[PDB]
């Protein structure tokens, strides 16, 4: 319901490298506007938004055996703000 | 055997079994009846790993499925279930007067 959150963290080696600079890997809503992607990270999450890139992606690879299946809708969005902070609370597993 | 079922976790001897001499049940369950006479296990050789107890043929097995309880032990074995004395407001308890006159009641028991 028009709520702020739009995303979940992504986990690449590069994402792990993402914090060396501040790129930010997020599974996201399949229709988020960059600005939302701006503001969401903003008042919901508190930065000076800078640099964004984003990826729609159709789902990848599965079976069960007796019938057929392929992975459902998915999407990515990436970003890095100037100050060099935030999400340091959120990189924590690696 | 649907959303409606039968006996509570209960206390009851049974008959045909090769075990007869029952009493407390353990845990009644859904469409497959599923409850425990707390008599007769088997083994199941629960693999081998220590996540299992390490040298299995495990010991707790209690799923003698069919309904067959000689229900409840108030002072009687098997009975029909009549219904309820009620009296007090929204009371039922479908307390069984059949020979013995009890519901295996929530008051006295489970």
């Amino acid at each position: 319901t028009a709520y702020d959150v739009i995303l979940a963290p992504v986990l690449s080696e590069k994402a792990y490298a993402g914090f060396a600079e501040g790129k930010y890997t997020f599974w996201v809503h399949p229709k988020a506007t960059k600005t939302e992607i701006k503001n969401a990270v903003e008042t919901a999450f508190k930065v000076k938004v800078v640099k964004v890139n984003t990826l729609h992606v159709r789902g990848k690879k599965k079976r069960l055996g007796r019938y057929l299946g392929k992975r459902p809708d998915r999407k990515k969005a990436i970003v890095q703000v100037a100050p060099g902070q935030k999400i340091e609370a959120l990189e924590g597993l690696i | 055997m649907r959303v409606k079922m039968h006996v509570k976790k209960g206390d009851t001897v049974l008959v045909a079994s090769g075990k007869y001499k029952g009493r407390v049940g353990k845990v009644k369950e859904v469409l497959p009846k599923k409850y425990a006479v707390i008599v007769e296990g088997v083994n199941i050789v629960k693999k081998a790993v220590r996540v299992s107890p390490k040298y299995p043929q495990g010991g707790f097995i209690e799923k003698e499925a069919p309904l067959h309880a000689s229900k409840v032990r108030p002072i009687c074995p098997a009975c029909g279930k009549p219904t309820r004395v009620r009296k007090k407001f929204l009371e039922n308890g479908k307390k069984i007067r059949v020979c013995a006159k009890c519901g295996g009641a929530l008051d006295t028991e489970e």
Binding site: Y3, P9, A44 | -
Partner: protein, 67 residues
Amino acid sequence: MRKQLEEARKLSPVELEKLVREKKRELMELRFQASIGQLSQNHKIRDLKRQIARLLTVLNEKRRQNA
């Protein structure tokens, strides 16, 4: 919690209409769990979502009380 709704029954406007936002956030926290905690939390995530609805609802349904 027998009475999850009562305070929710109580709140009348934005004070909730904002509170929910934070209260939403409390569940925003719950997606962070790719593998940070995710233990007993699996309930903690669950019906905490449910209240939100009512928070929608009561807003809605008191906006129905409103109209």
